[PDB]
Amino acid sequence: TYLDNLSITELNSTPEILDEPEVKIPTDQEIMDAHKIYFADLNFNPSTG
Amino acid sequence: TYLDNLSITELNSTPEILDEPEVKIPTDQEIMDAHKIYFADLNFNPSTG
């Protein structure tokens, strides 16, 4: 039951400073055709269909 | 054989039908689909295609 030094410290300093949390950027060459939706903006000419 | 009197006479006036108000009127239902030309009338709705 005898431990001559036993104590708590505050330790406000939390590591909010870190490394770079962003992995290396890719080029995405293989299949960028994974989109398939589009819209076509078009006008109407009356007196013909 | 022998016969002595021979006589022809009239009795009436027999009916005769007047059936001709030019009933022959040309219909000809193979010309009826020999038209082949038409025109459509559309109605354009913007913000959809």
PDB file of C-alpha atoms in Angstrom:
ATOM      1  CA  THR A   1       0.000   0.000   0.000  1.00  0.00           C
ATOM      2  CA  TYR A   2       3.037   2.366   0.090  1.00  0.00           C
ATOM      3  CA  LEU A   3       3.932   4.086  -3.199  1.00  0.00           C
ATOM      4  CA  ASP A   4       5.665   7.368  -2.361  1.00  0.00           C
ATOM      5  CA  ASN A   5       4.880   9.079  -5.700  1.00  0.00           C
ATOM      6  CA  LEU A   6       1.466   8.753  -7.350  1.00  0.00           C
ATOM      7  CA  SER A   7      -0.126  11.671  -9.147  1.00  0.00           C
ATOM      8  CA  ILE A   8      -2.319  13.009 -11.944  1.00  0.00           C
ATOM      9  CA  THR A   9      -1.275  15.568 -14.557  1.00  0.00           C
ATOM     10  CA  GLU A  10      -3.654  17.669 -16.608  1.00  0.00           C
ATOM     11  CA  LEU A  11      -2.232  17.048 -20.129  1.00  0.00           C
ATOM     12  CA  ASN A  12      -4.246  19.625 -22.043  1.00  0.00           C
ATOM     13  CA  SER A  13      -1.962  19.060 -25.057  1.00  0.00           C
ATOM     14  CA  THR A  14      -3.847  16.691 -27.363  1.00  0.00           C
ATOM     15  CA  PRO A  15      -2.295  15.805 -30.757  1.00  0.00           C
ATOM     16  CA  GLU A  16      -4.573  17.850 -33.006  1.00  0.00           C
ATOM     17  CA  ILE A  17      -1.423  18.331 -35.084  1.00  0.00           C
ATOM     18  CA  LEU A  18      -0.899  15.130 -37.059  1.00  0.00           C
ATOM     19  CA  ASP A  19       0.623  13.865 -40.343  1.00  0.00           C
ATOM     20  CA  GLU A  20      -0.888  14.480 -43.803  1.00  0.00           C
ATOM     21  CA  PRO A  21      -4.210  12.536 -43.673  1.00  0.00           C
ATOM     22  CA  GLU A  22      -4.648  12.478 -47.442  1.00  0.00           C
ATOM     23  CA  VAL A  23      -3.465   9.545 -49.556  1.00  0.00           C
ATOM     24  CA  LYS A  24      -1.801   9.883 -52.955  1.00  0.00           C
ATOM     25  CA  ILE A  25      -3.935  11.171 -55.824  1.00  0.00           C
ATOM     26  CA  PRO A  26      -4.894   8.688 -58.576  1.00  0.00           C
ATOM     27  CA  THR A  27      -5.307   9.343 -62.273  1.00  0.00           C
ATOM     28  CA  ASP A  28      -8.391   7.116 -62.872  1.00  0.00           C
ATOM     29  CA  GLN A  29      -7.493   5.919 -66.371  1.00  0.00           C
ATOM     30  CA  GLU A  30      -9.212   2.553 -66.544  1.00  0.00           C
ATOM     31  CA  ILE A  31     -12.983   2.995 -66.703  1.00  0.00           C
ATOM     32  CA  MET A  32     -14.204   6.538 -66.259  1.00  0.00           C
ATOM     33  CA  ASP A  33     -17.271   5.369 -68.211  1.00  0.00           C
ATOM     34  CA  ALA A  34     -18.982   4.534 -64.893  1.00  0.00           C
ATOM     35  CA  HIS A  35     -21.257   7.524 -65.467  1.00  0.00           C
ATOM     36  CA  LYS A  36     -24.092   6.946 -67.924  1.00  0.00           C
ATOM     37  CA  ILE A  37     -26.593   9.756 -67.288  1.00  0.00           C
ATOM     38  CA  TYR A  38     -26.833  12.830 -69.490  1.00  0.00           C
ATOM     39  CA  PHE A  39     -29.279  15.465 -70.664  1.00  0.00           C
ATOM     40  CA  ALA A  40     -29.641  16.940 -74.138  1.00  0.00           C
ATOM     41  CA  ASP A  41     -30.620  20.608 -74.342  1.00  0.00           C
ATOM     42  CA  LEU A  42     -32.532  21.044 -77.590  1.00  0.00           C
ATOM     43  CA  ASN A  43     -34.868  23.564 -79.218  1.00  0.00           C
ATOM     44  CA  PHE A  44     -38.131  23.288 -81.141  1.00  0.00           C
ATOM     45  CA  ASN A  45     -38.746  24.596 -84.643  1.00  0.00           C
ATOM     46  CA  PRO A  46     -42.457  25.183 -85.343  1.00  0.00           C
ATOM     47  CA  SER A  47     -44.164  24.636 -88.731  1.00  0.00           C
ATOM     48  CA  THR A  48     -42.150  21.380 -88.959  1.00  0.00           C
ATOM     49  CA  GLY A  49     -41.836  18.466 -86.546  1.00  0.00           C
TER      50      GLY A  49
ATOM     51  CA  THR B   1    -109.367 -31.074-136.590  1.00  0.00           C
ATOM     52  CA  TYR B   2    -110.854 -27.758-137.620  1.00  0.00           C
ATOM     53  CA  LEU B   3    -111.350 -24.474-135.776  1.00  0.00           C
ATOM     54  CA  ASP B   4    -113.498 -21.563-136.959  1.00  0.00           C
ATOM     55  CA  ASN B   5    -113.252 -18.450-134.738  1.00  0.00           C
ATOM     56  CA  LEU B   6    -109.872 -16.954-133.878  1.00  0.00           C
ATOM     57  CA  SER B   7    -109.791 -13.819-131.734  1.00  0.00           C
ATOM     58  CA  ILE B   8    -107.227 -11.751-129.842  1.00  0.00           C
ATOM     59  CA  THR B   9    -108.238  -8.950-127.484  1.00  0.00           C
ATOM     60  CA  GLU B  10    -106.826  -6.919-124.593  1.00  0.00           C
ATOM     61  CA  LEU B  11    -107.654  -6.885-120.898  1.00  0.00           C
ATOM     62  CA  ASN B  12    -105.300  -4.754-118.806  1.00  0.00           C
ATOM     63  CA  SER B  13    -102.026  -2.847-118.689  1.00  0.00           C
ATOM     64  CA  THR B  14     -99.250  -4.736-116.919  1.00  0.00           C
ATOM     65  CA  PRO B  15     -96.908  -2.820-114.579  1.00  0.00           C
ATOM     66  CA  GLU B  16     -93.322  -2.035-115.514  1.00  0.00           C
ATOM     67  CA  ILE B  17     -90.789  -0.973-112.900  1.00  0.00           C
ATOM     68  CA  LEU B  18     -88.953   2.352-113.228  1.00  0.00           C
ATOM     69  CA  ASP B  19     -85.846   1.526-111.167  1.00  0.00           C
ATOM     70  CA  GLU B  20     -83.186   4.003-112.268  1.00  0.00           C
ATOM     71  CA  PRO B  21     -82.452   7.129-110.105  1.00  0.00           C
ATOM     72  CA  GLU B  22     -78.780   6.693-111.165  1.00  0.00           C
ATOM     73  CA  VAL B  23     -77.978   4.562-108.127  1.00  0.00           C
ATOM     74  CA  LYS B  24     -74.498   3.630-109.390  1.00  0.00           C
ATOM     75  CA  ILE B  25     -72.226   5.945-107.384  1.00  0.00           C
ATOM     76  CA  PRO B  26     -68.483   5.099-107.335  1.00  0.00           C
ATOM     77  CA  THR B  27     -67.104   4.228-103.899  1.00  0.00           C
ATOM     78  CA  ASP B  28     -64.053   2.028-104.740  1.00  0.00           C
ATOM     79  CA  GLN B  29     -62.516   1.236-101.347  1.00  0.00           C
ATOM     80  CA  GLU B  30     -58.969   0.517-102.761  1.00  0.00           C
ATOM     81  CA  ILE B  31     -58.533   4.205-103.624  1.00  0.00           C
ATOM     82  CA  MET B  32     -59.828   4.885-100.076  1.00  0.00           C
ATOM     83  CA  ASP B  33     -56.383   4.126 -98.607  1.00  0.00           C
ATOM     84  CA  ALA B  34     -54.376   5.427-101.587  1.00  0.00           C
ATOM     85  CA  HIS B  35     -53.520   8.709 -99.880  1.00  0.00           C
ATOM     86  CA  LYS B  36     -50.180   7.992 -98.169  1.00  0.00           C
ATOM     87  CA  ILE B  37     -49.373  11.634 -97.252  1.00  0.00           C
ATOM     88  CA  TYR B  38     -50.101  13.247 -93.893  1.00  0.00           C
ATOM     89  CA  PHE B  39     -48.750  15.713 -91.357  1.00  0.00           C
ATOM     90  CA  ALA B  40     -48.368  15.428 -87.601  1.00  0.00           C
ATOM     91  CA  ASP B  41     -49.015  18.179 -85.063  1.00  0.00           C
ATOM     92  CA  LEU B  42     -46.730  17.923 -82.041  1.00  0.00           C
ATOM     93  CA  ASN B  43     -46.572  20.110 -78.940  1.00  0.00           C
ATOM     94  CA  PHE B  44     -43.132  20.635 -77.425  1.00  0.00           C
ATOM     95  CA  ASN B  45     -42.711  20.378 -73.653  1.00  0.00           C
ATOM     96  CA  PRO B  46     -39.518  22.063 -72.398  1.00  0.00           C
ATOM     97  CA  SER B  47     -37.487  20.839 -69.383  1.00  0.00           C
ATOM     98  CA  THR B  48     -38.196  17.269 -70.547  1.00  0.00           C
ATOM     99  CA  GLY B  49     -37.172  15.631 -73.788  1.00  0.00           C
TER     100      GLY B  49
END
